[PDB]
Amino acid sequence: IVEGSDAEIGMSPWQVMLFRKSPQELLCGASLISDRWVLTAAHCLLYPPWDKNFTENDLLVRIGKHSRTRYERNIEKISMLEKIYIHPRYNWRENLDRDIALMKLKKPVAFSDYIHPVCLPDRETAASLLQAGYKGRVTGWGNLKETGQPSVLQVVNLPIVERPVCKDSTRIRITDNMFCAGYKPDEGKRGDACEGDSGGPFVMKSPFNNRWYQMGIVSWGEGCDRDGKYGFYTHVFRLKKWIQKVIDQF
């Protein structure tokens, strides 16, 4: 996260760190959606142009974390993956359309002050909240600038941007399964996700029931926090049918 701030303890208790077993390092962000399901970006797991194709046994999930690097004894929990599910129409060849994956944990994780699932949007919440100018929040341990790394989880609040401004900021083909967020040059304030923030959540707090909902997944961007460019997020509600089916069958 660029131009963000340090998270408060327990501010984002659904935040998950995807962790490489060897060499032991952060791979991506992710989110806890129940005691046994973690949501992430497909490109964190499968991206042939970069020779990326991880399997269950290559990875661990770390939940309840604050510090990036430290082992947070008695606080974080580390979980093994039973199974990865990638959207069958994830488009890694062109534009990262449907950039979404589910990871089932081998055992349920125990909820605590620092570990708790986020909600996934219903159609009415999504309709009400996904509007240009409305702000959500992005969290992650990724880079602090485009060209180091933070000591603790970072947070930034960013406004959803209108679809025509999203489209006119890029040569990439944007789809209905994406939205973009961030400030305009005109707006003064700034901030963005960056490398390492991939797969983490864009959340909004519903003013109807005061619950946090994950509306997006950090998916892609051209540089980080560039003027006139915006970060792109997987539209979780648009893919919820796939999410439910996976969870309902498995």
């Binding site: 060499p23 390092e25 952060l26 990036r68 690097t69 082992y71 790394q149």
Partner: peptide, 10 residues
């Protein structure tokens, strides 16, 4: 690397 190694059990 910058990462504190984790419990061998994991």
């Amino acid at each position: 690397g910058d990462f504190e190694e984790i419990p061998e059990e994991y």
